[PDB]
Structure 1
């Protein structure tokens, strides 16, 4: 049997009945636990995930969690997972700090159940907004328009796996789109799109690459895990297109050769709609976002002003045990890692 190389993510069209189930379950959890960060909820998360999710989602996510095969892209698009009432959501705040988590509470429950069904445990990183909770609102901030962050817009967000500078980077990611009126394409890149292991990829197993943290450094491997069907930690903007990356001549050459091959495999075909969720295996699939002017789209050579882009990000880890040396004593879900093993030294 010849291998069918994955070039695009799996598309799941969520039904109205599934959407109704998710909504009621979300409301029931809100009443039962108050919020998705409730320790009683988090402790029994997987029980809630398998008992409350529409069964087809549970089967999809369970299959996905343990699938690192040649055929696995490492991303799923859940089309119309939720119905977003745009007027109730109201205008997009100036930045992420102004997000109404009282209004997003139900969405946090829904997202945590999806991670719970992998099974995987939502976590937070001190490296990202000093934790900032299990659910992050990703909003274009006008002050950060030209930055290579989630608060950016005007510049292309090059494909990257989340937190390539951390040894304990997220295992799984979820991106829930509340609004994408600018019609910004989601860009995804899978290491599986390369097919069979080749000489360009083999050089990436060498632990000779700089993985710069954003805010002499240790080096890591870009490819790891299985030698034939590997996992990836990669950030094009931070490791390649950064004068201060400090890469060796050999490492930069290897990364350049890899990027030349990888850029032809980037998939920007999917334009998320309000209510879509993209679920990612952060060890298989990198993500990015094309450049856009927040609060507008162009149709028929005319500018259509619109509400600014709003997406919700949640990250999870399949094992609390393996990350225990980098988590808070009183919170095994709070990762204090700063850079490839080094922990933040706070006073």
Structure 2
């Protein structure tokens, strides 16, 4: 019978036994490898992922990695993946630069294991903080309050797939919420929520769209690619549509406007992540964002509740080092040097 169109992500309630295993597995890996960027750990990542993760998590992620069917949302919420000791974590640093990665080391092991079970290899992009490592602290900055970045707060972060301007954008993403006391909803948008291929969607297969770099003669790409009936997406609502300098053709902007009108009714803002929740996303199916918020506060019965500022950890991964090899550093096949749709950063 009828197709069952996904409108929300799969919600997995992590158990106390699973939390405890992940903690003690994380603690063992820190003692064994020191840090999650250790080359000996990375080379044997999939082995540790499949051997050390709780069975149910491994099944969920293994199934998800190869699932591009009509019923797949392209996002999983792992509720209560970790217990965050808020007093040990201490105050949120002023910016991402202030993050203590010694503190976050266990979290980066746990996150890399989740990517390893897909299977997928964690990667870093020069397009993102000159690399910034395999794990990124996403903290609101007062200086970059009304910006279209993770460092943003005061404004809503319109739905986007990560790095729509790169031909070698992340395959999978994980967002580990350490703190979300402001109670900011995590917005998600799946191309699968559209259902069957329609004429509005078909126009997005044309490589007539500008994909500008993060907040004239640039190269163009297709918004939809992959299988013609069940496609993959590269989309940035703020950079491709709502940016004056997008440099779109009238035909291209119209097709993007027509698409946006359909897509915006499908955005899911129902999920407000709690501390210790992780959102695992297939970056080719599901776009992400987050609503506008005043960092360090929430409002209850018309009263301002001051709180600790939002703190989230982002990890990105690629399922094949082979494909991206032309754009990665010679001395590091996990470091992507791509700047814009095939073009590589010219440093000297």
- Please indicate the TM-score interval, normalised by the length of the shorter structure: over 0.9
- Measure the CA separation in 2 of the matches of 1:164 and 1:265: 20
- Equivalent position of 1:343 in the other structure: 344
> In the TM superposition, what is the alpha-carbon distance from 1:83 to its structure 2 partner?
0.0
- Measure the CA separation in 2 of the matches of 1:35 and 1:288: 29
Residues 113-136 of structure 1, C-alpha deviations (whole Å, 9 max, x = no match): 000000000000000000000000
TM-score of the pair, normalised by structure 2: 0.99
- Measure the CA separation in 2 of the matches of 1:219 and 1:337: 15
- Measure the CA separation in 2 of the matches of 1:23 and 1:243: 47
> In the TM superposition, what is the alpha-carbon distance from 1:2 to its structure 2 partner?
1.0
Residues 264-297 of structure 1, C-alpha deviations (whole Å, 9 max, x = no match): 0000000000000000000000000000000000
> In the TM superposition, what is the alpha-carbon distance from 1:214 to its structure 2 partner?
2.8
Question: Aligned to 1:303, what secondary structure does the other structure show?
Answer: strand
- Equivalent position of 2:123 in the other structure: 123
Q: Which runs of 4+ in 1 moved over 3 A?
A: none
Question: Aligned to 1:102, what secondary structure does the other structure show?
Answer: coil
- In the alignment of these two chains, the number of paired residues is 347
Question: Aligned to 2:103, what secondary structure does the other structure show?
Answer: helix
- Measure the CA separation in 1 of the matches of 2:194 and 2:82: 33
- Measure the CA separation in 2 of the matches of 1:229 and 1:41: 36
User: What residue ranges of structure 2 are gaps of 5+ in the alignment?
Assistant: none
| Counterpart contact for 2:163–2:214, Cα < 8 Å | no
- Measure the CA separation in 2 of the matches of 1:146 and 1:267: 22
Residues 230-262 of structure 1, C-alpha deviations (whole Å, 9 max, x = no match): 000000000000100000000000000000000
- Measure the CA separation in 1 of the matches of 2:176 and 2:305: 24
Residues 133-164 of structure 1, C-alpha deviations (whole Å, 9 max, x = no match): 00000000000001000000000100000000
Residues 144-199 of structure 1, C-alpha deviations (whole Å, 9 max, x = no match): 00100000000010000000000000000000000000000000000000000000
Question: Aligned to 2:131, what secondary structure does the other structure show?
Answer: coil
| Counterpart contact for 2:79–2:277, Cα < 8 Å | yes
Question: Is 1:287 aligned with 2:288?
Answer: yes
RMSD: 0.4
Question: Aligned to 1:203, what secondary structure does the other structure show?
Answer: helix
- Measure the CA separation in 1 of the matches of 2:177 and 2:247: 35
- Measure the CA separation in 2 of the matches of 1:19 and 1:242: 42
- Measure the CA separation in 2 of the matches of 1:213 and 1:297: 32
